[model samples]
Target chain A: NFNVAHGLAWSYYIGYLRLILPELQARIRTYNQHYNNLLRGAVSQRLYILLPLDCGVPDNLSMADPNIRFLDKLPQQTGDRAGIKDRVYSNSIYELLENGQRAGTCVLEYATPLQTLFAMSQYSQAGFSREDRLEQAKLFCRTLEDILADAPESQNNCRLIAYQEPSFSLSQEVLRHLRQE
Target chain B: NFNVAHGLAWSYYIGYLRLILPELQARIRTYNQHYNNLLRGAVSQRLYILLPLDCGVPDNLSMADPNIRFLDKLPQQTGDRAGIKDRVYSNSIYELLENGQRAGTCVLEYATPLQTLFAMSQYSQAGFSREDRLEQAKLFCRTLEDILADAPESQNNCRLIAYQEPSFSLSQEVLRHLRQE
Candidate 1:
């Protein structure tokens, strides 16, 4: 009877510990994750920078490039919301940053012709024959190469740091479109 | 004393009516406005049309035009959501419509180049030099004239019906930009 009583006491202790074990482990994991995030935030907080550049390129590089002219001289009227200048088209770049800071932004000048062609063909019904667009793309590439030769060391580092693999597979058709022209 | 009592009753009546007159008039005005809107809805219900057109044009119109491209050929993975294809941009014509429907939408074919220039410069950054953009604008105008000459009778009615003066004023700079080019 004494041995049976002792065994019953031990069983209760085991059951209570088993009930709390998973919850304790989960709590520990949550704390560890939070601690790791704080460490990362600390490291990034010390290094912050933003660079915006517009290299003056003649707008006449290619007639195919999408011309986005600003009409600043329109008779301005004070509206409900005043002091509005420009409308931002995309916010993905903004979302990627933390507290409006970045290590650097490396811009590729003279890439507009190629970028314009690629962008219009992909997103819009911009009427351009593939062969003609691809030919312009080659010009864009040549311009990019020349510009890169004169790029500063800081810009090169920035470009290398921001490198990423293609997020989608390019079809043979598109590849040919680029190669042909 | 009886004559005095009669005058007192009349005074009380006058006071009561004066207090209620403005409140009664306001309620009636609100009811009339609602009735007019209902009448307008009834009239518009009889006519509605939406025409979407794609007129082919060369992509290399000008660098100032907004170029929207898709990077579809890039490797894509299963995202948080799919089914995003085209992005609907400006809804200026909609601003003119009353209720949910318009009488008709007379679209121009291959008018994006001109339209893009007009839309951006008018609504966005119109900072481009007038000399260059206006020359392209003239070409756009010429093309529009040719297309309208062959336009169907129904479209002609739609165009004339929807015409309105510039809700926004044309700046001297933009006007000059167009005239000079």
Candidate 2:
């Protein structure tokens, strides 16, 4: 039988992550004026791409951080900042990026070559080898850096940078990797 | 009161984390046989901690993630795992360990030293700037190398050793600088 322990643990982690992450966003917002203006809709809220698939929807409709704005979903009817498009198929161009072939959406923030090198250098650490998600993690981070770079600035740096790469493809791969029974 | 937009954005991201994290944990449990065997308790169980007064606590009962175990409040009974008692009223050592400081129980994984380091390195990339926490991250790594020094079975070479010092503390003062902040 498949193990359910993981589900239980994640249920707990996600619970906390959902609640606290919003608070963190509020704190960061207080520290930045750029975000403060965006709050009034003076500027359209920034959007981030979640490669593979997006994970931005919360279960509770009211579970918003008092200070941060997590857009409900890529506005299907509007031209928003980013989209949560799947990498096409499970094993196509999307796979090339999501398969841990290079880095993931990390490039979204750190678009420069040097940032890429720096990120790769950090991953070169000893223990990463044991982490089965290392390859996919690499791709995720790489893609994130690039994406963040394209994102508008708030307080010199964007607080949106504090999230994990959410390529649905990447998340799916993670599921597959974790399911290796 | 904090900005509504900030709260909204983070809530959005939080929802995203909640939705996808369970899937990721499932994959971890099903796939990593070695790690799975070593894991204790339900992989999806929740461990809740009360935040400081400054750190807001939501009143919602549903703060718990449906897919995993989430402890919004400390259980009527605490566990022995709540180590290191607080010496002062300002310091709820348990809360500080699990929340204020990223070191203590924020990391719930049963990881090998190298594996822990690798994960820490990625977390570092995620914007964890606490020097003490960074030092704690490095400590596991340094200890791993020490253990490997005399092992005939140790096959990892310099390439893998990069994990040891992505942001070396001593000379660069990364830890020191962060500590000052």
Candidate 3:
């Protein structure tokens, strides 16, 4: 099992939203259809990316067309836990990665969203141990700092940048930006 | 500290969203707003209405406006667990309830949004006991059925037959439609 905390993904997503989607403030009626479609799909699809238990292995992890306005705003939150029943919210990442001993659950942090994407793809293809997956999540969580530092607009078309080579994987360069870190 | 669960009022609000809100199938953008708002507000006004600790209170209860959509849809999925959690993923409410029950946390089920409003108002006035507050919640939950059941239509100004409320609540007028069970 892994440390399950309130999925920082939503928190991170909110932080990113504060940076990007401020127009959404109290404008419920107009924003409802398109955004909920993305959210429902994301919640349903994200369960695969993070939990992937009853859901089968996914064949594609590409962003939805990349033109979607609020795509990058989704925070990366998932995984399992120990004493708690659900794995993702059982412990905070800080608690999970304490002392490098890996006490609670696996916590993976990445340098970039690309790096996280790469880790996910790499894990899927080559296969991953529980520790490897945990390491990957910690890596992904770490990327949030840099991801937050550069606003999505500052990155232009690159909404959520990944580090893995596109040829090595399938991510497009047109919309991808490497983190300066 | 009648029911120590009173301390976790806002957490219960989050639980309510996790279970009830998703059934409304709210779009992702608004859902994100809701999530961001819930976390922001949960830190302070967590238990405004969903708890028996307070009544007829308005403090954070204006949020009831946005949430009415889901509450309107509640009775339809009363028996559907997956349908409920599908609003906020799986087993979230169940987990929160389990934790609350374990911690001797307060429980809230309201019949009317107004009753929930009442709890918040009353709690803010005179101090409250868990039993006293919960009793009010039970009454409110039952009453909400009809208030919601006989709602006015969207197109008309509170027209009588313009709409049919979901099975979640029943109106006094509609009670004539059902045999006295």
Candidate 4:
């Protein structure tokens, strides 16, 4: 089985990611109870029920809030704006701080969702149509490059079904290591 | 953990499913080695690198053959037949035979991948745009309904983090049980 620690971090970050400014992760938990109230025994036809895999918020978030928009919305086009509801243009190629600084990158992420056709990125890419699959590949590769520059010979196997980094407790150790990256 | 037996059957059926006819399963194993030969060290852009999670094949079968089309080609439309590459319609709603018949349904499947917003169905749904999420829900419920009508009492909880049912070995037992459902 894959190590749970790396999963803890990967999922933690995805849970942190959102469509708007990074400030939302702080209160996103409140809406966790809010989203389940939408479905009336049916998949939402009017809205995507925008639940992120784990699961967040902002004003105008109503545009994409799974709770508010759960029975709430469309993906109509205005100019080239289209619907920003179910899509995102960038990624957590690096981690974000509350102040919005891109400091840490998940080195192990290079191989995280690898060997599989889909990534959370693809969910956005599929609808937004602006994703550069290999371009993003280069971002991952670039991270790998810097990772090699940093740790040089860290274990980074891409063929495995899951990540193989080694942690637990000392989430401080985990956070410090992730912080260093 | 989810019962391996139900996981076994659900995954087994998905493994059994194909974009084309079912007879190909007899030979799809050969392609398992064939697909890895593509990708010139890049994420597949020219082709989707048609690897099914566990991973198959057949021949014009060439149209969707992940190997042949791994770098091979459209999603283009002719008389409304857009890209069949990287997509499929319908589902293994019920199990099929080597001769093409709908026979069994995985009763445990209803809660299997529950609570999460995404399913393998969403993968196909993302691209094809023809999926009926609730309709599929009904099929699952219908199976549950029949099971309830049949046994009148079965363990089918939908809120746990994993399945609660039970089994192993005597895959003959597994197969026969699946056969009856």
What stretches of model 3 exceed 4 Å from their correct place?
Answer: A1-63, A66-176, A179-181, B1-88, B92-181
Tens-digit lDDT track of model 2 for A25-127: 3333342344333543222222222222112323221231211212222111211001111101000011112243322111011111112222222333322
Error of 3 at B7 (Å): 25
At residue A120, candidate 2 shows an lDDT of 23
lDDT of 3 by residue, B73-107 (tens): 01122321211111122211110112223211111
Q: Estimate candidate 3's alpha-carbon lDDT, on a 0 to 1 scale.
A: 0.26
**Arrange candidates by lDDT, highest first: which order?**
3, 2, 1, 4
Better of 2 and 3 by lDDT: 3
**Deviating ranges (above 4 Å) for candidate 1:** A1-88, A93-131, A140-181, B1-90, B93-132, B142-181
> Clashes per prediction?
28, 74, 59, 1
> Candidate 2, which segments miss by more than 4 Å at Cα?
A1-181, B1-15, B24-28, B31-34, B37-44, B47-50, B56-181
Which tens-of-lDDT digit does each residue in B57-167 have in candidate 1? Answer: 222211111121111111111111011111111111111222333322111112223333333233222232334344434433443344334433223222211111223
lDDT by residue for model 3 over A99-181, one digit each (tens)? 33322211112211222223333433223344444444454444433444554433322133333321232122211222121
- The C-alpha TM-scores of every prediction are 0.25, 0.18, 0.19, 0.19
Give the true-contact fraction for every prediction, in order.
0.00, 0.00, 0.00, 0.00
Better model by TM-score, 2 or 4? 4
Largest TM-score belongs to which candidate? 1
Candidate 1 chain B lowest-lDDT run of ten: B79-88
